[PDB]
């Protein structure tokens, strides 16, 4: 379906105005995005976790409904700075010290490091395509690999701001299936605009841990992977096929990870649009087994 989950509801965090979706009651269910994605990546998961806690969507600053950053450049929306508002925000909703996080991409390493931070809130780690660990370029997978070397140069503004590449080329190109005309401008509208407003979509390709740089967020993705490598909090590793980000070496070191049940859906890297009903009956599961009665 093509319809949000829930309705926008917005706080302001550090002046700015985020949007998050919040349905239901009891300890939170945190889905976290990535990118160029925003809550809406959730919308036909969230259903399946219908009674089983407080359903909570956040969108990235700069994402979704979220405001912008200004005045945006280059150095704005780095890892640091998301992990500022969305700290902010996830301590704004009062989330309590039992929560399930449920990933992606760019929300995998902010939840894991959250996480980290914060082991003993953290009730269950649900993810998928994530950023697990510091990766090496022979990691990446290789059809989008020239891509986001280049996003990672001097061409990347030009892709992204002025051509918003990462929305319209890269999102559906890790989509096994069609998207519709409706899902497509959900995606889209954070980023219709060229320049600044896909900021965000393009400072995130240049903070992934890769060949040792950004060093910053290589020393917190070491971290965490350290951490989750140990941690006995109980993890669904939703693993997929053909995946993308999260095989080879990532995959293998995701599967070492102790406490923690797998399955595997169809998908690419966005795999939400691809194995949603899949992936939220696995969720849902998984819940209530940490939910008992």
Same mark, same amino acid.
């Given at each position: 379906?093509?319809?949000?989950?829930?309705?926008?509801? +917005?706080?302001?965090?550090?002046? $700015? $105005?985020?949007?998050?979706?919040?349905?239901?009651?009891?300890?939170?269910?945190?889905?976290?995005?990535?990118?160029? #994605?925003?809550?809406?990546?959730?919308?036909?998961?969230?259903?399946?976790?219908?009674?089983?806690?407080?359903?909570?969507?956040?969108? !990235?600053?700069?994402?979704?409904?979220?405001?912008?950053?200004?005045?945006?450049?280059?150095?704005?929306?780095?890892?640091?700075?998301?992990?500022?508002?969305?700290?902010?925000?996830?301590?704004?909703?009062? !989330?309590?010290?039992?929560?399930?996080?449920?990933?992606?991409?760019?929300?995998?390493?902010?939840? +894991?490091?959250?996480?980290?931070?914060?082991?003993?809130? =953290?009730?269950?780690?649900?993810?998928?395509?994530?950023?697990?660990?510091?990766?090496? @370029?022979?990691?990446?997978?290789?059809?989008?690999?020239?891509?986001?070397?280049? +996003?990672?140069?001097?061409?990347?503004?030009?892709?992204?701001?002025?051509?918003?590449?990462? =929305?319209?080329? %890269?999102?559906?190109?890790?989509?096994?299936?069609?998207?519709? /005309?409706?899902?497509?401008?959900?995606? $889209?509208?954070?980023?219709?605009?060229?320049?600044?407003?896909? $900021?965000?979509?393009?400072?995130?390709?240049?903070?992934?841990?890769?060949?040792? #740089?950004?060093?910053? =967020? =290589?020393?917190?993705?070491?971290?965490?992977?350290? @951490?989750?490598?140990?941690?006995?909090?109980?993890?669904? +590793?939703?693993?997929?096929?053909?995946?993308?980000?999260?095989?080879?070496?990532?995959?293998?070191?995701?599967? #070492?990870?102790?406490?923690?049940?797998?399955?595997?859906?169809?998908?690419?890297?966005?795999?939400?649009?691809?194995?949603?009903? /899949?992936?939220?009956?696995?969720?849902?599961?998984? %819940?209530?087994?940490?939910?008992?009665?």
């Amino acid at each position: 379906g093509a319809k949000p989950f829930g309705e926008k509801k +917005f706080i302001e965090i550090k002046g $700015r $105005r985020m949007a998050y979706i919040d349905e239901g009651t009891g300890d939170p269910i945190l889905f976290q995005h990535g990118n160029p #994605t925003s809550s809406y990546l959730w919308r036909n998961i969230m259903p399946h976790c219908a009674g089983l806690g407080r359903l909570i969507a956040c969108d !990235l600053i700069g994402m979704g409904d979220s405001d912008k950053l200004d005045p945006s450049g280059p150095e704005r929306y780095a890892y640091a700075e998301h992990r500022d508002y969305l700290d902010a925000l996830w301590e704004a909703l009062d !989330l309590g010290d039992r929560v399930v996080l449920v990933v992606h991409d760019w929300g995998s390493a902010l939840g +894991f490091d959250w996480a980290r931070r914060h082991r003993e809130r =953290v009730q269950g780690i649900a993810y998928m395509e994530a950023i697990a660990m510091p990766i090496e @370029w022979a990691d990446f997978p290789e059809q989008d690999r020239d891509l986001f070397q280049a +996003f990672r140069s001097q061409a990347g503004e030009e892709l992204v701001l002025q051509d918003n590449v990462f =929305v319209e080329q %890269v999102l559906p190109g890790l989509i096994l299936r069609p998207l519709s /005309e409706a899902e497509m401008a959900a995606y $889209r509208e954070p980023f219709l605009a060229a320049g600044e407003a896909r $900021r965000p979509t393009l400072s995130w390709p240049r903070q992934i841990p890769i060949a040792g #740089t950004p060093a910053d =967020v =290589v020393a917190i993705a070491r971290d965490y992977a350290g @951490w989750l490598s140990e941690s006995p909090i109980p993890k669904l +590793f939703i693993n997929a096929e053909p995946g993308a980000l999260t095989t080879g070496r990532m995959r293998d070191f995701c599967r #070492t990870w102790p406490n923690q049940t797998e399955i595997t859906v169809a998908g690419a890297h966005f795999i939400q649009e691809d194995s949603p009903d /899949e992936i939220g009956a696995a969720i849902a599961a998984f %819940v209530r087994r940490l939910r008992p009665a």
